[PDB]
Amino acid sequence: FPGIRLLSNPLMGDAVSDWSPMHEAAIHGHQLSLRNLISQGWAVNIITADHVSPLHEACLGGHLSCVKILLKHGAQVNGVTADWHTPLFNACVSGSWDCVNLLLQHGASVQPESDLASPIHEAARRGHVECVNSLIAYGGNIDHKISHLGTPLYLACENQQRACVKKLLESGADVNQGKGQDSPLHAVVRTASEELACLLMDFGADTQAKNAEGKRPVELVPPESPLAQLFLERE
């Protein structure tokens, strides 16, 4: 990339490689401090040994004015850390829809290449509905299914994000797409989440779908449980 790097010295660990005063200012939302460092000739595209830029940190803190000044001075929008995080992913972590919108305005890719850090999944799993909204407005696939993770719907259910599950279903998410053959309905009955089971069913979940073990959702609940009596009622 076109930018300054901070290298680790594995033989000299006190030597700084994991931070700088630019990162320091970004993480704490000190945009005036960032201004001063920039006017002193410090690059905004400066990455730690783990490939973290000040923009990554500003986004993680929801520091909108810091994001703006970094972007103004050429901060890379789509940089990926050693953990595959993009600035957009980090904004989704923080829940700052303002930061998310601004990044998307600056052409941030809605769906980065590493399915190891999906913004829409992260937003959904955290219940950040506004962030989910912004991603969809910029082309994000509400049903994007990742191997060994699932859909945003599946993750929202798994993390008990009832308001988010409701919003995803209201926005047209496929009620029946989960993770592999484990539909969202299977997953929530297994955890005995009656709120989520009824919500999913209200939006047309398939009570007859079979999972990897060949089992319908009803077969994952105790026969005397209130869920079982609901499933039986419908059959």
From Swiss-Prot:
Intervals holding ANK repeats? 17-46, 50-79, 83-112, 115-144, 148-177, 180-209
Q: Name one GO biological process term.
A: proteasome-mediated ubiquitin-dependent protein catabolic process
Entry annotated with the keyword Ion transport = no
Phosphoserine: which positions carry it?
Answer: 33
One GO CC term on file? Cul5-RING ubiquitin ligase complex
| Compartment list | Mitochondrion
Q: In which pathway does it act?
A: Protein modification; protein ubiquitination
Keyword terms of this UniProt record: Acetylation, ANK repeat, Mitochondrion, Phosphoprotein, Repeat, Ubl conjugation pathway
What's an example of a GO molecular-function annotation for this chain? Answer: ubiquitin-like ligase-substrate adaptor activity
Question: Tissue range of expression?
Answer: Predominantly expressed in testis, kidney, and liver.
The primary site where this protein sits is mitochondrion
Homology family: Belongs to the ankyrin SOCS box (ASB) family.
Q: State what this protein does.
A: Substrate-recognition component of a cullin-5-RING E3 ubiquitin-protein ligase complex (ECS complex, also named CRL5 complex), which mediates the ubiquitination and subsequent proteasomal degradation of target proteins. The ECS(ASB9) complex catalyzes ubiquitination of creatine kinases CKB and CKMT1A.
Protein name per its UniProtKB record: Ankyrin repeat and SOCS box protein 9
- The species is Homo sapiens
Record lineage: Eukaryota, Metazoa, Chordata, Craniata, Vertebrata
Write the gene name.
Answer: ASB9
Shown chain mapped onto the complete sequence: 19 to 253 of 294
